[model samples]
Target chain A: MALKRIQKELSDLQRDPPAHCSAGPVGDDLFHWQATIMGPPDSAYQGGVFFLTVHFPTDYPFKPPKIAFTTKIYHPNINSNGSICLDILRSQWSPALTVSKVLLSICSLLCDPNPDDPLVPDIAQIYKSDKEKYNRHAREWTQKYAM
Target chain B: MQIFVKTLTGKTITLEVEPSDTIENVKAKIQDKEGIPPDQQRLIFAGKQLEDGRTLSDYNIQKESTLHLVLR
Candidate 1:
């Protein structure tokens, strides 16, 4: 039932996607999907495209999907290994979270990463000291990786 | 229990909080030293998201657990 719900949600989104994002099935596999999210305007990550993968388990909804960055990004919250430090992606997940909600949360995360609590300490330190430089590096990484 | 709260710069502050306290309260407590607002804060533990409904007693958060802040 949960997978069916996710499938329907995917169908609805594909039928009518938001201007900032586009979602589709990855190789005709409903369980795996690839999404491209446009960065928010004027943010350090703006004008960049971030790619992510969503893998739904058989027990999805009860036990959330495995989401990871397919597009490389440099941020305090994102590690070189493509791990994200968002809470909703982890233990804070609830049954109420839908496919749309998860994507929206990831979009918001690119806008603001918590440097004080970061996965990449070097990036965090840089962010803590000079935000402009951090932003510049993020832009650079986006150009190089996420595009 | 007594816990030593540490700043991002590794400075420590001594305080005591009940196991029943929520992550939000911990953020409010740490705000005095971090100079950040609780409304614009998130507490992430062990790479996982913490919610207000989860009291310290619910997890490994005990007498001396270190909390991380995600300031807005």
Candidate 2:
């Protein structure tokens, strides 16, 4: 997208900060943004604040912005490094999708982690096996790191 | 000054307001625009809940400020 288009997202975001989430330019670099997602109340990650980094390509919405969590989280769909296994950010990305929608979708991921298709297989195995154990582990990390 | 009230449905109500307008004052306009009851409306901005007696300027709400409207 054009520089103006990038600015469009920022302005639109300013006019409408998504629920439990807010983001903005870190400095003069409009292409790079700092975003934060509060842990969803329904999930084990509740009472946490997770920071993420987003770097959009020069091509803009044609390519998905590279998103990685700077804050540590314990979830099957997310790894120790905060990489996600989400298809929407990859092959399924579309110009029709806005950053606001993406963050809202990410919120849903916190509520319903995709264990069947996971980035952290070890964590996924736990989520698939003992449900309570997975939630507690996730909750522990939420307190230790994200909090 | 103009402020924006956005809902979970992505509908934004453009509200003509003054900085001194109270939370309850804004809620009345929202109620006038839509059928929502002021009592059921909870306006939040910058992660803080807006109390009915507080003025928009109290929160430093300026031109183009956006507040989210949630029903509780």
Candidate 3:
């Protein structure tokens, strides 16, 4: 059931792709995927393309897939180990949310990181107290790794 | 009745619910509007996590009351 659902989602993504992101399975593995997200315009992460890996559970749609940044990113909600602190990736996931939606959410997170609930607390503090420095570091990291 | 729902991120929204609505029903409604699934939602009112099998009246939830929604 999970594999069928993922295949259906892939077809839907191909037909009606979301803006700022593209995703497809890696090799012949239906449960493993490589996704790319174009950094949102007008944000510090602009002009960078981020690569990520998604590992779907066998009980996917019921259990949320695990996603992590393969390309290093400097953000409050994303940590050094590439773990993301997005709610949908954790406790807020619904079977209704698709890969396209997840990618879109990641792009949105880039635009407006949730500093209050951050994976990297230091970055979150800097984001809250020093917006200028936070943007600078974010842009610098984006250039170094994501460009 | 109107209830205030605060998310883990501190974003709040007002929901209009009836006294007869079950917590499960409320969770479904929240899922539809907020994108949080029923199973993922941990609704807390008066320091108690709302039970899916119970009704709003059973919890004595009132209009203008606040409910905190945490993702578990």
Counted clashes in each candidate structure:
0, 0, 0
Q: Which digits, one per residue and each the tens of the lDDT, describe model 3 over residues A92-142?
A: 999999988988898899989998898889999999899999999999998
Q: Rank the candidates by lDDT, best first.
A: 3, 2, 1
Native contact fraction per model: 0.00, 0.05, 0.00
Better of 1 and 2 by DockQ: 2
Q: Each candidate's DockQ score against the native complex? A: 0.01, 0.10, 0.01
Considering every candidate listed, which one attains the maximal lDDT? 3
Segments of candidate 2 deviating more than 4 angstroms = B1-72
DockQ measured for candidate 3: 0.01
Per-residue C-alpha lDDT of model 1 across residues A49-140, encoded as one tens digit per residue: 67777778788788887888878888888787778788887889987887667777878888777877789899999888998889889888
Pairs of residues clashing in candidate 2: none
* List of clashing residue pairs for candidate 3: none
lDDT (10s digit) by residue, model 2, range A1-147 = 458877888778776577567666655677887777767777898867677888888988888888888889888888777787788999999988877788878889989889889888898899879989989999999889864
Question: Considering TM-score, which of the candidate structures 1 and 2 is the better prediction for this target?
Answer: 2
What value does the lDDT take at residue A82 in candidate 2? 79
Q: Candidate 2, A13: how far from true, in Å? A: 1.2
The prediction achieving the highest DockQ against the true structure is 2
Off by over 4 Å in 3: B1-72
Model 3 chain A lDDT-worst window of ten = A13-22
Q: List chain A TM-scores, every candidate, in order.
A: 0.91, 0.96, 0.97
